[PDB]
């Protein structure tokens, strides 16, 4: 179902990749997470000083995979600007939240959710790290995050901006 | 995979032919795969030319709200005006994407079915998303919210004629 | 679907999938379960990169929960005996054969991103005997070699499901550096 | 669909390594996987009858008729076929490994080599005198008497690379570089 | 999966350039029709050069398979047959119907003339035609062929050479 | 399965006015309990029913039919939790007769009711909170607070909370 | 599976003229009710039947065979509700003896019936609304409006609507 | 399938007459609830005679399984435990929670205190309670129990006797 | 559902033969099939602790923990358990057969007896010292040294009834009446 | 569903399924594929009938295409070593183990109905060897014994799928009488 | 779905079996054929001189199984009267045809078909025996049967009586 473009033959995502556009669409997992990392590493290699535009529509997924992407965004040289174009739940909100400071966006009707669900024992811990990371990027107190996450504090686009997950709603 | 000149194969198919003329299809269920495709095509057509109008032909029974509203917003906030043409069925998110078309360019073919009811899809309180939908359906149609809220409650069915008078479309292509 | 990159290289205006493009930088990926299919893709790529140059480093990005011990052994062995240093970089998970593959990288060139998780549990995974699992001792020596750890320590922690964050794996000796910029 | 690929449908890593006369057997030997090896071995022979072939083997074995086809093709064609074990060579896998050119049969050190060949072979009764050509072939390449081969092919014996060198199944164990 | 050659050709396409065709796996309309297409194609390219038909099959459909046999027969170029692995049922017939003096097997192959079930009962005078075909090409008495087909006679490369199913075993 | 006289094991225990709810609360399982409660009412309406509960809950519709049937029959329905009382199980356990609700010490009790069970028609949610509050001796304000999160409880806390009256620690 | 008395638990409650519709109304579930109603009528034609309902409804054809069997038999069919009554469950609840239709407070009654159960021949849906209008006491144009709408009603509202006589609270 | 006795009793029913109960296979609501029913039934028949609880289980659900443990504890009669085959996870706990001096194993059985995954992360202070239970009944230090549970400590009948999981090995 | 049955749910042929203290193991040893034997062995013990039990075995084996449960139950209970092989006794099947009362272990003459015990046993590593109690048990009942048992339990050796008598796995081969 | 027969027998007014009722006349049935489940029902019944009387004949009605060789061997062996003569009667098919079971009946008491079909093909049907199929020789001797036929004749005709009508099986020695009234 | 009767508890077929009524319903196979043989053997044993009523509604099935039943009907002492109560195709017609001379019936609307379909090679032969058996019971020439069977000569109840498959149509 994916169309093709010229300028050479290109699928549409591949064409949009040339303009430094990366997509995450649907659930985060070893396949979808590793392809984002692959595109990010590639775009850094082409130009280490040009911004990348990371469009996110995700109900989240695996934490190991998602944190792989999150780390990669922080530690590549380029600024990864994050746009939410539908949803950003679970790891979707964290990857959104972890975009480059001042370049985190959402469309108005999207739904940002910050609760990280179920998907060895003392090992969470990981959850503490997700709260500490969300607190850095939003600026909230760690306590505020810990109270707000073990509860699916659902938020519209304007509510997420107040909370510090994104920087700008796109009304234009 | 359609009639192909020469999934992610190497070919120039019918949809790739018509994308060169800025035409875009939503055919079938709205979901993460299908919605992201529209949004990808809309972003692509904008970077090619930000002034030329896009022709977004729609035949959907609806589906996911989050993904659907993601398309709606993209239609609104890209510079190019998006024309909408209903070519069979426009229910739930189909009707909202249709009705969300640029002012003056919201078409439907004579026999099409527009249905404006929207079904569900922790939480319960969280479905004030239904109020965001009702505002936007009122904003584009021109109807009152007390009408839109009540009228978008029951499974209301419209032929193209009724969808013009209601305000979901601006014309009906008899010529 | 996998994205596609078009380039030139004094040879032609060539077209690569995103992974083949990164293979030009000597970047191989192991992503997901270690089985025959995925272990031979890795091994294939390592041989290809050696055939192109046996001295330039290889950067092996690992995000695996593990899998087959024989298939992973092939990869581990391939990493040791091709001429170029295989630098390993963990970008999510490295459990079981994955943590052996991560720890089997060149001295001083094993990395992990900060949020990655590493487990050194070596689970049970045609017909052959229990005493014939002296494959288990080889894993434990391979790990004890590469970590700098006492063999008794590796035997104690491998039948324990002992989970570690990135920096803890640094402490234990599974990696050399966590990546912080 | 296929895996790390250049295009101009696509030119995968196995193809790229076939330009270098490198061939794999990965997973169980069957009609599909065995004919692929046979077709590569024939193609490589026709490109250049004199340059060597490098056959990297990771297999639990499988079909005897299919595998014997591969085995036979390796002796038939003009090129020396070097064999390298890169994980498992079991049953037909061990036979194919052991059937590489004299002095050019390698194994990685962690590899497991199992000469036991189990049922099914495919109608089947005493006409599993296929089992006797198996053992003659295995005897010829190893230098073992036919007694020991029959003894050891009917018991599930497991060898690491060094026992496999000792036994004659392979000439070298890659312990370096 | 099938590797590719650049000069993008799949490996069987590239071997087709050298007039080499394969029957691998079960004989059925699809696989039989494929072999027929290749034999047709190669003749139109050159009707005077041999074709090399490598066979690893356990047989299968009689109609489909006899279609392949008939095409081998009635095309101009000699079709030389080489067994690599198994030749059972319609595989052993197709092996045995290669050009005279040009039927081969590699020495570890297994050849089986028995042909099972794969209409009416009286319409297995198709069975009679197969046994004639096998008799003609082997040199054997029809009585011998009919004995050895109802029995599941299993032959190695040497036995098949002695029976007349193939002309040479090659090393 | 198992059988006895002085009848499966569950039928035998139904003579001693004992009823089990075991596993998911659905139209099948709810109705058997309702049917058992009704039968026990007609057999002797003064005497007490002992209702054992080990369930992660299920349907609200099916579950509340059991709740009502406990209240609006003659007998006191004494509840005991013997493993798990989640979702509707918490409520059915909480809805036993006044002063007659028990739990075994290792039991886990969870008042949260998940979405399974459209829109504002989830005012049912307020009837649950009210039903709980009324039986718990706890304010609608904290009851809604706790049912909006995955709030686990041991038998000790459940008693202090109000959900049960006695934790069995003896004979 | 199901317990035993002295009979199985449902048969023993049939000894006291109690009948259950549990889960979906279909050929199988509806015919069991229909056979139980006939049996109770043959045991004593005057005594009241008690018909507990917990259903999301289902097949219109089968569910209307049982609704007719309630009217056609002599015994007054008391309909009690114990959790849910949607689609045919709403109709079978309403179709009980006037003076003897009951519910429990937490129950959820829904008059809406789905699509699944010739096109013009679904004039059957207009018979449905007539029969509801007859048992409720409402005008027909109120019923056709309300059905087609997902209008959820709890026991106190269902009393006001005419769908039921009482609400049990003791 | 289960044979029948006439005196039609199934064989487990007939052994119930001699106060013998089985946990065979995985511990889950169904199987756990069954065991609880039998322990309840046998006490009402006679609260002063021992019960003989034969255990061949690899464990399973913690909630369900602790329900069985608690019932064994708090009923009047001693529940003597006998391991025939396997006692892993909730099986080894249930074995170990039998009456003091009356916990048995046949000499070839395999006993494993390790308990895996089968809510929230903080709600595995259930893990703490299990390790207390195991510590209490074994006589071991909680530190030892916690070491040996996170490890997959596999014990034979003799080792389990030495550890205090059982009181006797019998021949 | 069940098979040739009297009623007064039903009284099948296995029940009718259980009145005669005859017990079967039919098909693979698992938690369901093994506990059935254990429950019968216990029931027969409780009916009458002194009269013998006749255990007719047709099994490819299966689960070691489950089967050892059966094995142990046979030694535990008071009654002599006679074992009769009626087709296959393999792995756990051969162990159960061999674990019958001294002098009361029979086999029909066409039966196949295979002492090879394969994986899976069930987490599993050196804790397959279950394998060492297997061999001690097999050694005790047969009279074979532990060497020979370890040698022969790890190779797929097949015995007809007369080799099984010779080896000590059974005391008698039913050649009459 | 299986029909049910009610009777009396100085014991009670008992109730049998149709097969248990015929078991009172010492009639056992093997119907369909020989496997572990069906071979033990047969063997169970044979032991039961012997336990009731070891001298009264048993009438074993066979309609099977065959199946497992070990399971059928059990039945064949059970037929030889219980004290009462097992008369066999073929009522449809007897192929493979079924024809061995039919032919394994008591001397002079093996029957078939006229329209029955008998094949003596012994097909291939945990892990063990090819030479270990000297089970095949035992079948061939068991058949050569019971048929009166030369062992070479049985070896020739068993790998041939040699089909026979009832009266042909009489000629070959597989049965004694065809039933004609 | 099968009801129960008194006089003792009885399923309906079991009750009807006491009046010497046997049923074959649906496809002929090892299960359904062996149960008819079992009932026939049983009814002979109860009374060897009382007729048995064999009601047949069958599309036929396996020939080995069906010929097992056919033989049993001929060689038990009782006369097996055969009634067709719906269909009697393939082996259904042969079992119908092979009822006791003068006691073979059909209801008027039933459909008798005499073609034996597909379900080693020279082995048919069996088919020759089916034609010879059908010729005995009907009285037709063997040639007539051989021509008429390798063709699905379909027949109503009155046409079957003319042909000799049954003796009487039941119009009363």
């Amino acid at each position: 179902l994916v169309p093709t473009v010229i300028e050479r033959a290109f699928d549409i995502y591949s064409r949009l990749l040339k303009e430094r556009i990366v997509f995450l669409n649907g659930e985060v997992n070893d396949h979808s997470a590793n392809l984002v990392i692959a595109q990010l590493l590639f775009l850094e290699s082409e130009d280490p000083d040009k911004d990348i535009y990371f469009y996110i529509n995700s109900p989240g997924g695996m934490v190991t995979a998602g944190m792989g992407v999150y780390d990669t965004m922080q530690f590549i040289k380029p600024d990864v600007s994050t746009i939410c174009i539908g949803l950003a739940a679970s790891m979707g909100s964290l990857l959104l939240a972890g975009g480059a400071k001042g370049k985190r966006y959402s469309l108005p009707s999207s739904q940002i959710m910050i609760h990280q669900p179920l998907g060895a024992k003392n090992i969470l811990r990981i959850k503490d790290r997700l709260n500490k990371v969300l607190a850095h990027h939003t600026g909230q107190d760690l306590e505020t995050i810990v109270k707000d996450t073990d509860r699916d504090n659902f938020m519209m686009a304007d509510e997420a901006k107040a909370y510090g997950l994104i920087d700008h709603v796109i009304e234009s």
Side-chain angles (χ1 to χ4, degrees), chain A residues 45 50 53-54 64 129 141:
Chain A
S45 197
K50 271 184 193 149
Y53 307 107
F54 184 24
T64 45
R129 197 197 180 77
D141 292 315

Side-chain angles (χ1 to χ4, degrees), chain A residues 84-150:
Chain A
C84 178
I85 59 155
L87 175 69
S90 160
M91 289 295 330
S93 41
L94 198 140
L95 293 174
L96 178 55
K101 211 174 213 163
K103 301 165 166 158
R104 306 174 301 171
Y105 300 86
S106 178
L107 301 177
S109 305
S110 297
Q111 295 161 46
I112 299 91
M113 303 178 215
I114 55 162
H115 164 73
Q116 174 48 232
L118 31 138
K121 51 106 201 286
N122 188 83
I123 300 337
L124 309 62
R125 224 169 98 208
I126 292 153
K127 190 188 64 147
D128 179 45
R129 197 197 180 77
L130 302 180
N131 294 328
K132 284 176 183 157
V133 159
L134 280 187
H136 177 75
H137 290 278
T138 58
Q140 302 294 335
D141 292 315
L142 187 66
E143 185 173 20
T144 312
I145 301 302
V146 173
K147 300 217 202 97
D148 288 333
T149 51
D150 323 326

Side-chain angles (χ1 to χ4, degrees), chain A residues 97 104 134 137-140 159-167:
Chain A
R104 306 174 301 171
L134 280 187
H137 290 278
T138 58
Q140 302 294 335
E159 294 173 46
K161 192 202 150 192
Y163 201 82
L165 295 158
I166 66 179
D167 288 310

Side-chain angles (χ1 to χ4, degrees), chain A residues 40 51-54 72-73 76 78-82 98-100 103:
Chain A
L40 288 179
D51 287 9
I52 300 169
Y53 307 107
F54 184 24
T72 302
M73 295 158 65
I76 65 156
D79 278 350
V80 176
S81 176
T82 59
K103 301 165 166 158

Side-chain angles (χ1 to χ4, degrees), chain A residues 24 26-29 57-62 87-93 116-117:
Chain A
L24 174 57
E27 206 200 343
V28 182
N29 56 44
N57 174 49
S58 188
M62 300 166 54
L87 175 69
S90 160
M91 289 295 330
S93 41
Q116 174 48 232

